[PDB]
Amino acid sequence: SRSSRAGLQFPVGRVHRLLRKGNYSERVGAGAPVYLAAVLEYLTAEILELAGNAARDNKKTRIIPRHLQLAIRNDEELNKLLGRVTIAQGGVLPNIQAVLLP
Amino acid sequence: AKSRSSRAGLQFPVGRVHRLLRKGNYSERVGAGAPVYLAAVLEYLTAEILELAGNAARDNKKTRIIPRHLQLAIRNDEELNKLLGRVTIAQGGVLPNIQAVLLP
Amino acid sequence: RKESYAIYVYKVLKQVHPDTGISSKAMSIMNSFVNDVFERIAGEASRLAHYNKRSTITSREIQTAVRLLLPGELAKHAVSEGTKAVTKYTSA
Amino acid sequence: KESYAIYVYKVLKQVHPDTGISSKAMSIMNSFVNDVFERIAGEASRLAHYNKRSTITSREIQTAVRLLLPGELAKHAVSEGTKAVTKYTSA
Amino acid sequence: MALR
Amino acid sequence: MALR
Amino acid sequence: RDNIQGITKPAIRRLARRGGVKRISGLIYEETRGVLKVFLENVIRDAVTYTEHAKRKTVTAMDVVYALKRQGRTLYGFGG
Amino acid sequence: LRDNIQGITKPAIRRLARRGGVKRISGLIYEETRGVLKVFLENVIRDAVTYTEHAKRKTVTAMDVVYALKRQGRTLYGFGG
Amino acid sequence: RYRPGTVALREIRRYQKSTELLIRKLPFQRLVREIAQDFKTDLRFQSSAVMALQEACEAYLVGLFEDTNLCAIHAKRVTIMPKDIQLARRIRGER
Amino acid sequence: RYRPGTVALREIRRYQKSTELLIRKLPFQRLVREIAQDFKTDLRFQSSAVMALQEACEAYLVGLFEDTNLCAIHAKRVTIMPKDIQLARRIRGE
DNA sequence: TCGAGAATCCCGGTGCCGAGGCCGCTCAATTGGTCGTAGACAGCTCTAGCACCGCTTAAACGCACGTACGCGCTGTCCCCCGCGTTTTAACCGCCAAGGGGATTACTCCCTAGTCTCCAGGCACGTGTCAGATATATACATCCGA
DNA sequence: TCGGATGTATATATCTGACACGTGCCTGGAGACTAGGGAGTAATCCCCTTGGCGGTTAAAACGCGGGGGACAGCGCGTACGTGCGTTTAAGCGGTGCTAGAGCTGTCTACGACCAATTGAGCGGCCTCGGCACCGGGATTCTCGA
């Protein structure tokens, strides 16, 4: 399989077919699915590492939307990446203005 | 008639728009009324903009349209300013507004 | 051979404001505006066709994208003009 | 219907062997993968069109990744993509 | 054509 | 798997 | 049908509290109603347009997601 | 190339603020304006240079700058595109 | 009795930690239907569609309130006001 | 001797009626080249590219100053301070 | 600084609703070959981006003044806030009906492709024209007297 | 309450660089014909939406007393506008040059396309485990002296 050959977890064949059927271009090179799949897997691993850390700090084992939102907003670079993105049932970051604090 | 634009009674190039739709990887196939509709929309938008640009030019006692006129025409109209709300016209300037508190 | 909307924009200007001119930089801005509107409409139409599992882009998709993209009165008049053009072309 | 849920779970077991994931979280992550895939494909498509080229290749993908990603994220995704491509061709 |  |  | 009154004052207070707000003015509720009404019309117009193009009568979560994406307000968790 | 931010002079910032309709200016506005302009310029230039590098060129083009501007949501008319 | 400024802080801390929906579902559903009436008649809705609408609306309102609070703090106040809301929205580029 | 603010309003009128560029061309170009030195050495620039950069930067700064003026007015003031610029940037999301 | 009064976190019981793992099928990914053409590469051209110079001169700069305006403070008062009571309708099952989404199959007409001619549109060529300064003059318009 | 000095709009000249029109001709748009398949239409089923009912009880509405913060006024000091004389480098017009952008030739390496497999991946199903909630105690806050 092309995913095992590439050394990844994401479906290189499915990604290739999506690239060819998404009407992005007339032709798709053979290395582009590998590149895109590697990037997708890396970004997923980043999010899940941070979210698992938040879940563990929360004394829970199951990652939930609150943990995902906590990880994303705590990470500044990922906050920039997912700027105009709402995460359902995610909430907000706890913060209060110091002037409002007594 | 001969040209596809003449049959539709338009000014914008129906055949050129059909070619661009086909070559743009927007879709695998393109219907035969789609370029007609798109060219009509483009012509209407160009007329809408150019009428107001000429109005501003005539207000400024001018006979030639300039980027300043295009900017005035776009920014003065409530809907064109909404369509082009994230566009920067080169050499356009800004609408002459002054806040009331600043005035004496 | 670089194609542009120069002659068509000038023809529209003649038909709308007969005794007026247009500078070349204003002409460049007009050309950019046309290219931008075409790209936005065609991109929304393609996205719509992908959503609906279609393969061809029709005047239905073009009209729906025009509705989605233009503010109210512009949308009304643009739809009227598109419908008129397609109707006359089909009648011919 | 198809989804990235199984591969996302595989990555999750790679990074946190003892951690579950709820269906809402999996749906959110599936949406995230779809959105980022669409963004990178769109940027590479625009690039290939700008260059009068009819092929999306690893160079187009790498440039799109560099355009979309901030700092360390781009610098690390580029390395992951390069390693994947190198290994894939070598095998 | 027909303007606003 | 090179993470940050 | 005066259904916008259903967005009651304590709910707007809860939203403000989640936004980190400590004191509220009396007119804030009536202004918030207008803001929210405008936002809802902006999204629902596009959702209904998508539904009409599909030749349907049930507005779908996919239609709502597309309507939100068109306005740079991408929503995650509903098949985005 | 060094210390070139000071080419953005205080009267130039005053003129930009006047076109923005500002009647009075604090003395510490000019350094802040220089910082903001630097950040915006760095973003735009990085994107344009990425485009030129991908095109195998040693020349930054108005088209590349325009593509960078459009990518940041700052579409610019008048220079083609 | 609890002095003013304490219960508000307690409520802030409580609501910035929970993640549930802060608007009543039946009133929101009725409002959505009434608004949609003007675009079409005899319209049905999916439950997930109404839920997505609520999620987007509540997130938008929370962000708007955060920016309104920044405007209030800038103006040397503690109480958010309609001028604060309007300033935040107009700087955001919606009015 | 004019009262303060009169020349300020006259300048607002002048520069809001005009449309030319308000930054100096050679200093702006040297700044652009210096900034691009950090991404790829020995890079050439088209004149059209530098003009486009300058038009973008001037328009962006003008809009930002408009928002800053609004913030200052909101604070019951007529002088713009760096807090106004910072708040405008935060609200815009930059 | 030193008392009490509540709010809420932590520990333990627990139950239960849906996630993790386990199969049957199946379509989609893989493997092999063949083939047309896209694009890497090589070379000659010619534009244009860079560099040096000399002169104006217009903008940038520094400085002295003084006047408006941030800014702190004090007092008033009215308007949110917190709290206890009565009132409203949301929420929760649960049932009943059926509208319409989602799927399969049969037609058939609309679009891609291909071979031709054939003019619309670009680059080139070329002659006239609206106006930015330049010079001079009249009309507001606040500032000192 | 009148007079003045600075900026701004008005009259007219000019020499211009810019543009609005005519043209070779070549490349792209239009005709003529077909081949297939995308989509329309019809029909069915059963998901999932909509409408009604009965209860309970948490949230909403409402009044009340007060204290806290919004706001108006006032006085001060400082920092920013204004104007003038001096210093600097931007701008303009040339002049020279070679890097690199762009275009032609070529021809091969890579991706599309097709037939035939065979397995990874998508639904149904179970079974049981960690977190929502509750009973009870203790820490962290606030409110009052």
Author numbering:
A (entry chain C): 16 to 117
B (entry chain G): 14 to 117
C (entry chain H): 30 to 121
D (entry chain D): 31 to 121
E (entry chain K), F (entry chain L): 6 to 9
G (entry chain F): 23 to 102
H (entry chain B): 22 to 102
I (entry chain E): 40 to 134
Give passages from the manuscript.
The proper control of mitosis depends on the ubiquitin-mediated degradation of the right mitotic regulator at the right time. This is effected by the Anaphase Promoting Complex/Cyclosome (APC/C) ubiquitin ligase that is regulated by the Spindle Assembly Checkpoint (SAC). Moreover, we have identified the molecular mechanism promoting this localised interaction: we found that a loop on APC3 and the N-terminus of Cyclin B1 both contain distinct nucleosome-binding motifs that regulate chromatin localisation. We conclude that nucleosomes facilitate the interaction between Cyclin B1 and the APC/C to promote the rapid degradation of Cyclin B1 during metaphase and safeguard genomic stability.
The sequence of the first seven amino acids of Cyclin B1 are conserved and resembles an arginine anchor motif. We obtained a reconstruction at 2.5 Å resolution showing residues 2–4 of Cyclin B1 interacting with the nucleosome acidic patch on the NCP. Cyclin B1 Arginine 4 establishes hydrogen bonding with the acidic patch residues Aspartic acid 90 and Glutamic acid 92 in H2A, and the peptide backbone of Cyclin B1 Alanine 2 interacts with H2B Glutamic acid 110. We obtained similar results using an N-terminal peptide containing the first 23 amino acids of Cyclin B1. 4C and EV3E), or when the first nine amino acids of Cyclin B1 were deleted (Cyclin B1Δ9), or when amino acids 3 to 7 were mutated to alanine (Cyclin B13A5, Fig. EV3G,H). Ectopic Cyclin B1WT-mScarlet largely overlapped with endogenous Cyclin B1-mEmerald, whereas a Cyclin B14E7E-mScarlet mutant failed to localise to the chromosomes. To determine whether the N-terminus of Cyclin B1 was sufficient to localise a protein to the chromosomes, we tagged Securin with residues 1 to 9 of Cyclin B1. Securin-mScarlet, was enriched at the mitotic spindle but largely excluded from chromatin, but the Cyclin B1-Securin fusion protein (Cyclin B1(1-9)-Securin-mScarlet) partially localised to chromosomes. We conclude that the N-terminus of Cyclin B1 acts as an arginine anchor to dock Cyclin B1 to the acidic patch of nucleosomes during mitosis. We conclude that the binding between the N-terminus of Cyclin B1 and the nucleosome acidic patch confers timely degradation on Cyclin B1.
